Amino acid sequence: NLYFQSMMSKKISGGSVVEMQGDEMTRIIWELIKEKLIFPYVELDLHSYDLGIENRDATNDQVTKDAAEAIKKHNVGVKCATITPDEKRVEEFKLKQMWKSPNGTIRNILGGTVFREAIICKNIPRLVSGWVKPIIIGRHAYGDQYRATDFVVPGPGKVEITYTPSDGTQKVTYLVHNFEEGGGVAMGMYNQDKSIEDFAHSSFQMALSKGWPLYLSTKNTILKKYDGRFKDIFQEIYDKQYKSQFEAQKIWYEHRLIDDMVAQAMKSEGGFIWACKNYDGDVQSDSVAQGYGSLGMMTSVLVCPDGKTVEAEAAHGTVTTNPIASIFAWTRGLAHRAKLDNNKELAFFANALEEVSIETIEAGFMTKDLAACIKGLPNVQRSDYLNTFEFMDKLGENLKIKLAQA
Amino acid sequence: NLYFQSMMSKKISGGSVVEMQGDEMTRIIWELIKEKLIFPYVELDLHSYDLGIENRDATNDQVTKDAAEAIKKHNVGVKCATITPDEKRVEEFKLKQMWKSPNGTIRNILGGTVFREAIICKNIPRLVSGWVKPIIIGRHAYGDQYRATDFVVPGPGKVEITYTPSDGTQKVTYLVHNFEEGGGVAMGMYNQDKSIEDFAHSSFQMALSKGWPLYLSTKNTILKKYDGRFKDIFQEIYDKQYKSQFEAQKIWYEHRLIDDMVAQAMKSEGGFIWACKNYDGDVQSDSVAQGYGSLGMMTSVLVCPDGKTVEAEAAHGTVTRHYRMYQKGQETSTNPIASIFAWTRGLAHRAKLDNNKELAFFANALEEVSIETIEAGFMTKDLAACIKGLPNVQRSDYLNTFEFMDKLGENLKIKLAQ
Ligand SMILES: [K+]
Ligand SMILES: [K+]
Ligand SMILES: [Mg+2]
Ligand SMILES: [Mg+2]
């Protein structure tokens, strides 16, 4: 019967995508984006996992692990912002327990490097004067504080850390501290050579791809072994495989100590790749995003080690109405889907939604937070901005106009 | 015999001060500051320790400890920037070992909180537009990464971490990671309740002393025990001893997630106290300093739990490229302000312990002379580049190292006369 029916869609054939629905207001906006900007124009084979807090509670966090496995399988995730619950959220939402970070879980499973960068609009002023070009952070997605084991130390006693080799070689025990004073806290943490090796590769690849120098930040003067391993693995790798390519593009790779690097970034004019360790990537990406003008205006795409799988996300929720991050999580995921499938139509679509998003804002049609950034929240009146629904409609109006013209 | 001596000296009694000498170019600046700005006007009972890399090696780092012990006993330490050696430095100076950070060692011994703030000059432009009031970081000086135990995992095996209470009760053992396909790195780190409590007290005290809100940063959503312990301790203490005082003064205390916080700071207008965990304090102070216009223009004073002991330091330093020029006799234009303010701040504290109004007056006068000079248009090359951009800086725009010290010296002389 497949030969006899021509039941092929008038929409762009979008292909396979794993979606992860999120929390709060972002979940609401997500749907609006789906209904007004994506689905009218693109048919998709969506696999949908509800990662809202309330469904994670219902499925004892299993849905998160399944969402992650589905991403391994279909190669593209697009995720809405979610809650990582604290003490008070457990009470508020009558939850079973404090579900660990879903992003942590997803990233542990998938692996890779999370590339984050501002979404720049000519009329949204920067907070840092000299940043005339973008700064791209590659956040190492694995290990460190995100897969640590931390605990309270109730009283006097000795915390030790040990390593028992797989083979026969005996144990190595190291004192961490001898509490004789009272109690405190203690943690152990780790990372792994292959993950680090992958981290490096991606960073070198991004640098080459943009034509920009790369810096890795650590604090190997203090963490001589732990961070020394990062510094070493990157240097090794750069010398063997990338130095010549880099010299050919008139760019370079340097290690920097973390505190020097943040000052360097702040003093810079932009236009470099910044390889960061997990925590640092988490911390510096927010700073950089806010420095470009808005915390919400940011892309964030986990690029897996397999050179194929990708998870795009809206990284921030409501900050404490801006749909652009969510919009661009869809466009970046679809741009990548179009890459895998060699679909010129899908990639034209993704790119056009992005342009229209930015042209709309540049033309003076924007949500309240963006209008706050221009003239200060105290000075903002109703007529300066569009509400969530009105903004989405206005983007719909303009996306339709621009997709017609092709 | 003092009664018959009818003349009093021109100098001021400084009193008892511990000195920690440093490395390279910051050390040069340090002796210049002493030769030309302090000694001509102030008589000190200097207890000097040499923390230059060569003497650290000579004494197997014992001098670093003795200096720290001496600050405990005498209450005021001033520290010049030192070299924390990597492999290149081990080869260069044939060192016995790769000596640990002296600051780490000193902070671990003294404890407390390192208070960091930009040194503001009206003509040195900020990079962050909103930052019209200062930001003061309180960096917890003890533990976490700076007293950690880290190592290479050579191949497959199992890393675990265990606590063994000394009341005998029972081992806990947590598995950290079971490496299976290869190797990597692992580390253990800790902090201590009393230290966290002192950290809290100082942060709260600083906010009341300045009249500004306080914010503590952690990532307790992720590290629920380790960072929760900071969050819990600050809250308890705030609720129990400082909350009504804060409300009485239109100020507040809030815990923020570290990523939220750095962004908050970026879009803020300053005017707050930011308590940072050891690592964040190191990272964020530099970022804050650089956003006010210049990394080097920063105060850094560690305040011990006792309330009496203080260690002022030049926190950015050594400036090796200039030192190599200095060794060859070539002109440098090295910014001495950090090292000057380490002196002026250790002295102001000395003045306070001793009710010495003359010293308090001098410390403050040198500070204001430093800033008036820069504001008046006389400055080193780095600060001229902040105004004009580096490629537009001519030789006539700035003063070399010695020229600038002399200018500060004559400006100081005048101020002290009037
Ligand atoms: K450093
Ligand atoms: K967060
Ligand atoms: Mg973050
Ligand atoms: Mg630092």
* CA–CA separation, A33 and B288 (whole Å): 38
How close A11 comes to chain B (CA, Å)? Answer: 40
Angle between helix A324-341 and helix A344-362 axes, rounded to 10 deg? 160
CA distances to B21, B31, B137 from B114, rounded to whole Å, are 19, 24, 8
* Probe site for chain A from B222, B225, B254 (most A CB atoms < 10 A): B222
Q: Does the annotation flag A251 for ligand binding?
A: no
Gap between the Cα atoms of B107 and B141, Å rounded = 6
First-residue to last-residue Cα distance in chain A: 34
Question: Ligand 4 mean position to B316 CA, how many Å?
Answer: 7
How far apart are alpha carbons B418 and A79 in whole angstroms? 68
CB B51 within 8 A of CB B26: no
**CA nearest B177 in A: which residue?**
A190
Q: How many CB atoms lie within 10 A of CB A38?
A: 22
Q: Are A288 and B263 in contact (CB under 8 A)?
A: no
Q: Are B234 and B275 in contact (CB under 8 A)?
A: yes
Please give the residue of chain A at the shortest CA–CA distance from B222: A146
Q: Are B16 and B45 in contact (CB under 8 A)?
A: yes
- Asked whether the beta carbons of residue A129 and residue B130 sit closer than 8 angstroms, the reply is no
Contact by Cβ (8 Å): B358, B12: yes
CA angle A261/A265/A267 to nearest 5° reads 115
Phi-psi region of A37 (alpha: psi -120 to 50; beta: other; left: phi over 0): alpha
Rounded Cα gap, residues A27 and A80, in angstroms? 7
Burial letters A311-329, b for 16+ CB under 10 A, else e: bbbbbbbeeebbbbbbbbb
**Residues contacting residue A93 through CB under 8 Å, at least 6 positions apart:** A53, A54, A57, A85
Topology annotation, domain A1-406: Isopropylmalate Dehydrogenase (3.40.718)
Measure B373 CA to nearest chain A CA, in Å. Answer: 24
Tokens 């003061």 -> residue: B136
Resolution, Å (one decimal): 2.5
What residues of chain B lie within 8 A of the CB of A162, using their CB? 159-162
Residue of A nearest to B102 (CA): A222
Q: In sequence order, what E strands does B243-317 have?
A: 253-257, 272-276, 298-303, 310-313
Ligand nearest to the CA of B295: 4
- Reported as type and span, the H/E element at residue B116 is strand B113-118
Residue B203, both tokens: 């942060």
- CATH code at B1-418: 3.40.718.10
CA distance A64 to A58: 12
User: CB under 8 Å to A275, separation ≥6 — which residues?
Assistant: A137, A138, A140, A199, A200, A203, A214, A215, A216, A217, A234
- Are β-strands A12-21 and A157-165 bridged in parallel, bridged antiparallel, or unpaired? unpaired
d(CA A260, CA A242): 24
Is residue B297 within 8 A of residue B121, CB to CB? The reply is: yes
Max Cα-Cα span within chain B: 84
Structure-derived torsion over alpha carbons of residues A89, A92, A95, A99, reported in degrees to the nearest 10: -10
Strand stretches in A135-249, DSSP E: 135-140, 149-153, 157-165, 172-179, 184-192, 214-218
Quote the tokens at residue B117.
Answer: 């703030």
What the block records as the tokens of B11 is 């100098």
Q: Which residues contact A147 (CB under 8 A, 6 or more apart)?
A: A104, A108, A189, A190, B177
DSSP structural state of residue B302:
E
Q: Does residue A229 contact residue B185 with C-beta atoms inside 8 Å?
A: yes
Contact B253, B234 (CB under 8 A): yes
A116 is in an annotated binding site: yes
* HSE of A284, CA atoms in CB hemisphere, 13 A: 33
Q: Which two tokens stand for residue B146?
A: 């700076």
Span from the CA of A103 to the centroid of ligand 2 (angstroms): 11
CB atoms closer than 10 angstroms to residue B266: 25
The backbone region for B132, taken as left when phi is positive above 0, alpha when psi lies in -120 to 50, beta otherwise, is alpha
Side chain identity at residue B360, one-letter code: A
Q: Is the dihedral of CA A20, A403, A41, A384 positive or negative?
A: positive
